A paper describes a structure:
The production of PIA depends on the expression of the icaADBC operon, and TcaR and IcaR are a weak and a strong negative regulator of transcription of the ica locus, respectively. As the MarR-type proteins can act as positive, negative, or bifunctional regulators, TcaR also acts as a multi-functional regulator. The overall structure of each monomer could be divided into two functional domains, one is the dimerization domain and the other is the winged helix-turn-helix (wHTH) DNA binding domain. In addition, the wHTH DNA binding domain is composed of α2-α3-α4-βA-W1-βB which adopts the winged-helix-fold, and the amino acid sequences of this domain are highly conserved.
In the present study, we found that TcaR could interact with ssDNA and the result demonstrated that TcaR shows a stronger preference toward GC-rich ssDNA than to dsDNA by using EMSA, CD, and Biacore experiments. To clarify whether the ssDNA binding site of TcaR is close, or identical, to the dsDNA binding site, a TcaR quadruple mutant (4 positively charged amino acids responsible for DNA binding mutated to alanines to produce R71A/K73A/R93A/K95A) was designed and its ssDNA and dsDNA binding ability tested. The mutant failed to interact with either dsDNA or ssDNA. This indicated that these amino acids are essential for binding in both ssDNA and dsDNA. Interestingly, the association rate of GC33 ssDNA is two-times higher than IcaR DNA1, but the dissociation rate of IcaR DNA1 is the lowest compared to the DNA fragments tested in this study, suggesting different modes of interaction occurs in ssDNA-TcaR and dsDNA-TcaR complex. Taken together, we demonstrate that TcaR shows a higher binding affinity to ssDNA than to dsDNA, and several antibiotics could regulate the ssDNA binding activity of TcaR. M13-based in vitro DNA replication assay showed that the addition of TcaR protein to the reaction mixture, and incubation for up to 30 min, resulted in almost no DNA replication activity compared to controls. This indicated that TcaR markedly inhibits DNA replication and that the mechanism of inhibition, at least in part, involves interaction with viral ssDNA. The observed biological differences point to a remarkable plasticity of TcaR. These findings, thus, may support a hypothesis that TcaR might interfere with viral ssDNA replication and establish a link between TcaR and ssDNA phage resistance.
Residue numbers in the entry:
A (entry chain B): 5 to 85, 95 to 151
B (entry chain A): 3 to 85, 95 to 151
Amino acid sequence: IEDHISFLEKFINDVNTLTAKLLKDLQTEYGISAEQSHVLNMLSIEALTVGQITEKQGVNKAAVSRRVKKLLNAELVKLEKKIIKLSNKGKKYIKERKAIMSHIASDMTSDFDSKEIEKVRQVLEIIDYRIQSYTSKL
Amino acid sequence: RRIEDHISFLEKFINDVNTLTAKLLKDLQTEYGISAEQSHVLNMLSIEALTVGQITEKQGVNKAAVSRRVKKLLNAELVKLEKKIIKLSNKGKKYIKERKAIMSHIASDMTSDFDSKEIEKVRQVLEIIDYRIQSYTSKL
């Protein structure tokens, strides 16, 4: 009933704990820190302004600037005419990120029935839609 | 390309959950006067009690701040210490009630039109995957 809300909070805390560990090597190699990639993670999807990044994060604007800048500076993020995209060097990062997510996601979904995963992704697309429809409303 | 579709979705999914929980809790974290990060640090205590180290990589984001924001919790006097594990206030639970409360006033009103076999199967699948993930972790 709402053991769901906890499970979710726990499911998400575990994919973050795990993601971080598998990405530690790739992050130091790039000098980029976790939140910096985690922003490299948001911008993978769409081209935000530093303001849009804070609101979509709950954190202190100041730190979003610490990060946004250290990034451009690193030529990983490529500002556009303040709407920022992903520098082509920041692309090769993302390629190497899903390259690892995948060798573990499949390693844990060897035995699954896609015809079964299908239906849950349908349910998660609808909840997702409903959650996005709240991005709005104020 | 191939199965990257399902995780890219899973990530776009967590993202929105984070974005929303964030938005839906400002007015509330602001009303208790705490940051989000010292709140995340606060939901992990509604479970049990935590050590500065117990959270370090277990949170992901390092270990420095673990104390820096633990102290303002200590000091804003709404999360109790232990020896280096830490429990919760008991007027901090008051808050977590306020949190858990409003997060449902909305999540059910966001999933109420399904009935069961539907949702239970998503849960069952995320559970196995959560089982997998954890077993797979196993490290410092």
